[PDB]
Symmetry: C3
Subunit: 340 residues, 3 copies
């Protein structure tokens, strides 16, 4: 080790609310720590850093991966958890977030929140007096992108993040697209957002990310042209075209518009890269074995929406590794911020 | 045997041999005794388990949770809402995600095919806490209960009758179970509600190799004669209102378990069993409605039978936990 | 000493089931567990115990308090939350209790009528703890009493005076009155007469108070009710499971019993502290509190933002104390 201890010190007791709050080196540290926790777990060697800690998991919206990842990470690390689901949160109905935060802060050692506006999780993080972690808001999904970056490194045969190029296809203005962009800029990556112009991320956020990328040697491109957007890419990433809490009416105008950005074998071919890999944050509509995906695909005469079955189940697909990595990276966040 | 059960799924009794099942029951008895003596050894220490419930059932859920906790495991309960399951995400995808994070997975839900797909794709042991077709954990508990209440008689020596609607998961599983263990079972109920004929035939073939016996009849007196245990279950549909129940009630009524039926066994030591919940009085809102509408205090069983010295329903309910514990310990335990 | 032995395996269903000294022992035990936790010295008395948490109505504080208390003490919990079926719809409480009692070492219940939790307590065969019913909320009042002692500079409970404002016939009002009487306190219930506690309960509390040197007063008069008080307490004017229509004819009636700075002033006590069981409607940062206040042109309902956020307010200490006191209950009744 000639490895700087600065980042571990600086992460203690921090919140984890969005990637904008962290430096390039803090993010890289979290990723490295994830890889170490993953290896220790696989070897049966894990040391518990959250022993006797109690954590509250507030979910104002649904979750499989994120909830499970927080629970399993906590359990592995010796913590106990209270899961408060959508019909359990009183928040903003009967009790303010300020009040809730102060009450939970007195009983728990750490708090996860998944919900609506970034402003809510920021208020929670300002008032709880303990580390608060964002498990998804309307604007950002930071833990997902940690997982994505660990996954890219593992699947890149020695290449660093600064050296990787990737394209995100579809609706770029969603939490995942925003976080991928902030992330790419911070780590010095080359990201292409490839989708209809009306769904590019907020201009203000793009400009802040362009400024970050200039200092890190990263690169950000927005385009409607699939062939140009995906050329040379190591990874292709997509997500369901409609977000959590949006009405079924959102699918009316979006499909014909989003259709040309579907990830299919042809798109993988246009990368020119036989080693291209496919990523997706999940859940995905890639066949008819989903009630919603079946009806929508049928309604518009399709077989799979944002990605096809052939791509999803091909050897190019690394979605299940990526999913597993949610737990390891969330573990790193809790260990760095709350671990002793 | 112990070696052979490691990492198996527990999806239905048809997947196991007579001796495997007996091993599970024996292991249950041992774990029960160890718990009672304060002597229990934890075999699931460091294990994390996901409990998927697509339809709620607080009894099966509680048995999994208590069994896991006693054995040093931690659990994540995923109930009918708050998940992404059946609707936003396929079972194949869910299975592969959960399998990466958890060491074992319980599922309670709809078709056997779903729990089979989960079991084929998760990469870890998957346990069936109830599907439309089978309810294997309930029958383990039932068999342990019978052995405990039979003064040293083995299962092969026991005779029992199940009354009512035999065409569902508990009836199916009792029949598969009886056949495997060489028992003498009578299914006593209207012919239209006997189990699937294909399943009966497969059970008849099993019963031949084990010296078991299977009888289906509409005759109560003949069905219950000589029985050590009488078993029943709710026979109206829970998805339906008490207003829809007229036909089914009149049809099932003569198979009610009441004191007379116990008498017709000719066995003063006969015991009464029920998987629960049970409609045995007018204390509930649904019991009040039924009492008003059909002039009946209790449906499949009467209050007098349910609360009598013959009833072992609460021992049977406690045994859900000890048996579920054995399943997890045998398949995942270190 | 005697009290510890006498509490083992008891239910905790209402304060009317305990003696003065048992309550004081619970409070003392709470303070000891609080200190042990803060010092990293806590001994786990509930190791290997499994506890069922039945919630038929919503909770933040009470659920969390039970979970954290159980975890700190080495227990594990199963949370069974509100659904479309209540116990008694399709399975009796008598059946449920006997099944849970075979699997769990202790059971919490929050729900509707006190008769339900009494039935659970009669049939479970293990200690059963009332986390709130229509009639009573006993764990809340333990927490309140610990909090008052901590904020009273060595004064005992018998020496404290406090007023509860608003709808006095709710679970918290009833339990504060039973509590005051048991511990020899001077309580004033200050609210419209139609919302005073049942006459049968008042009379039982008056008889208790007489032998403890406590005092109970009911009045519609704020000034006279709050004069000389160490603590002022209030709660939301409409209870859980009442219809949203209840607000409409209750706000105007309750409005004069709002806790605002004037009221604090009428105590004549510069050291007066403010308490609330929570949650509270004190500004526009909830959809319900904003809509109801807006309907009558108000800012805050039962308490104002200014009072809620002032140095007089000890509501967050009070909330933290829910956990320490719930822990005492479990440890005394079930703790090996
Ligand atoms: Cl982010
Ligand atoms: Cl089976
Ligand atoms: Cl009380
Ligand atoms: Mg482990």
């Amino acid at each position: 080790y000639f490895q700087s201890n600065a980042m571990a010190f600086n992460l203690r007791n921090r919140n984890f609310l969005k990637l904008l709050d962290f430096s390039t080196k803090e993010i890289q540290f979290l990723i490295d720590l994830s890889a170490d926790l993953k290896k220790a777990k696989y070897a049966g060697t894990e040391q518990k850093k959250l022993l006797g800690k109690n954590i509250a998991l507030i979910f104002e919206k649904a979750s499989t991966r994120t909830r499970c990842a927080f629970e399993v990470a906590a359990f592995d690390q010796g913590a106990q958890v209270t899961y408060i689901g959508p019909s359990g949160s009183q928040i903003g109905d009967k009790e303010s977030m300020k009040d809730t935060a102060r009450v939970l802060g007195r009983m728990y050692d750490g708090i996860q929140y998944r919900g609506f506006g970034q402003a809510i999780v920021e208020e929670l993080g300002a008032f709880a007096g303990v580390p608060v972690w964002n498990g998804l808001t309307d604007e950002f999904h930071p833990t997902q992108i940690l997982a994505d970056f660990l996954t890219m490194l593992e699947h890149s045969q020695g290449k660093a993040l600064a050296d990787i190029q990737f394209a995100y296809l579809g609706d770029a203005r969603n939490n995942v697209g925003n976080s991928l962009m902030v992330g790419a800029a911070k780590m010095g990556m080359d990201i292409r957002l490839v989708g209809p112009q009306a769904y590019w991320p907020d201009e203000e956020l793009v400009a802040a990310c362009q400024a970050i990328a200039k200092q890190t040697g990263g690169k950000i491109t927005l385009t409607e042209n699939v062939a140009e957007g995906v050329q040379g890419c190591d990874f292709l990433y997509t997500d369901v075209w409609v977000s959590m809490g949006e009405s079924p009416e959102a699918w009316d105008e979006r499909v014909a518009l989003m259709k040309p950005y579907q990830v299919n074998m042809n798109v993988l071919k246009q990368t020119g890269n036989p080693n291209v890999k496919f990523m997706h944050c999940l859940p995905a509509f890639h066949n008819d074995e989903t009630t919603i995906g079946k009806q929508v695909a049928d309604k518009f005469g399709m077989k799979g929406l944002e990605v096809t079955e052939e791509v999803f189940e091909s050897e190019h697909s690394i979605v299940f590794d990526e999913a597993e990595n949610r737990m390891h990276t969330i573990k790193a966040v809790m260990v760095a911020t709350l671990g002793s």
